[PDB]
Symmetry: D2
Subunit: 135 residues, 4 copies
């Protein structure tokens, strides 16, 4: 991948009915960043990928899932409450349907593409960790 | 009536000095017309009234900033960036310097120069937003 | 009172089934500090008052309630996980019986001395605010 | 078996430099004999293994600190202050400098000098404690 790998967490043990809050500083001048959740690096239930400019996307959020290292079909959100070099916060509610809380107060649904009962893997790409909290 | 906001928390003796920041998280009242976070020395003397308006007065999805001295409002500054949804959580961070910086949750900042001399912000209030947390650094 | 008044919060609207977490820096070299919860300054459901040295108490927590400015009967805890000039954290679970979570993992019960359904008043004395959060 | 702790979170690519601190909140496993928070470059090379022991080996209600290089443990440092209860939440803060400072939740600090040269802590692990939050400053 092109992005700079930042923090990874393994053995996260995040079960359904719980949420993860990710705060961090978006890389200055970056084209895109991502927060990934899943079972391991090859198996992502949620790849949340705001793009300043990448591929055909400009100030768009791409969401996707990855199974055995193959990407599923992208879903795209046009709301874009981000600025590179700035702090941001994303909250992920883990249920049968994931809810991504954007920092502008919008909630984006993303249904689980594959059955999963525990998220053990979390990764940050092109965003420097400030804090991660689970509730 | 609805031209008035419901008072939420008031914090006194905040002792926020220049070179420091305050972070406010809270849940915006559902269906509300506007909400505010106010900073100053007391309710009559505000160095920064940060008032996002969903619909109020002539303003639609617009941030109004102002100051208040001796209970009289000064000139409004308006910002068109509007990263808020009523009924949702939000976070505003205020960097206290000679020029206040209002960090919006979409990563934009709004400068707001101190309109009167002030060295300590001791008063912070929330209106039409329910406290989740307040942090100082 | 002798202690330095630090932050006060009014209109806190803390209902039963919820908790407040108070982080702060204990005044350097201080004799005691307190976190107070109640309906207003004259009416405290919980005055949590760790004493380094005050009155007959040395490295003891005094808990009390105050009604119309008159103190009730003190309850005292000997566990003393505090150091003056240092950061600390106290968590208060609001129920019919308040639970004070000390930073050493101990939970101290304090029953409500008077009927109260909302805590609207919070005060810090001889401790400088770092953060207050409600859940 | 019970001489081994259950692995909890592992964080890699932490990029913690000197002059900065990491704060770890978590819930200590109920009934457990010991728990640990480890800092270093990987699991074989630890600049600080902070291991409060309820009862383990010759140690009762004692903090064991050590370092590990090339998967070999160095000399244990023991601290008698023990502000922990199994099954409860706890918070440990680590200030990374030439001398690490371990801030215990009772307000005591434990110095732990760097036993080998290190400029970045990239690995952080929790054993017999369930993550609540990790924060860097
Ligand atoms: O679906 C998420 C991944 O997208 C990959 O990029 C896609 C791109 O989004 C699409 O427009 C088309 O161009 O093909 C690209 C490569 O398959 C990223 O490279 C990857 O990192 C994910 O974000
Ligand atoms: O400037 C902040 C205060 O505005 C007051 O309303 C203004 C209004 O914004 C303006 O368009 C005109 O109508 O005058 C009003 C009175 O000064 C709000 O009433 C007040 O709560 C502040 O937000
Ligand atoms: O009960 C809490 C209040 O105690 C007052 O001090 C008591 C003291 O604890 C007791 O030993 C006896 O000496 O009388 C004192 C005064 O009534 C404090 O002054 C007050 O601030 C509370 O902490
Ligand atoms: O020094 C940290 C490691 O200690 C290991 O156990 C020690 C034990 O503390 C000591 O008393 C003696 O029994 O030798 C043992 C082996 O080095 C733990 O097994 C290990 O997990 C660390 O905590």
């Amino acid at each position: 991948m092109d992005m700079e790998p930042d923090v990874r967490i393994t053995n996260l043990n995040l079960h359904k009915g719980h949420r993860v809050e990710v705060r961090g500083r978006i890389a200055k001048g970056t084209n895109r960043f991502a927060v990934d959740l899943g079972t391991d690096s090859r198996n992502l239930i949620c790849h949340c990928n705001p793009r300043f400019e990448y591929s055909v996307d400009k100030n768009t959020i791409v969401l996707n899932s990855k199974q055995n290292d193959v990407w599923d079909i992208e879903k795209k959100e046009t709301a874009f409450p981000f600025k590179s070099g700035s702090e941001t916060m994303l909250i992920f509610d883990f249920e049968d349907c994931i809810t991504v809380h954007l920092p502008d107060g919008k909630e984006i649904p993303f249904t689980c593409r594959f059955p999963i009962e525990v998220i053990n893997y979390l990764a940050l790409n092109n965003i420097e960790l400030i804090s991660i909290s689970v509730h």
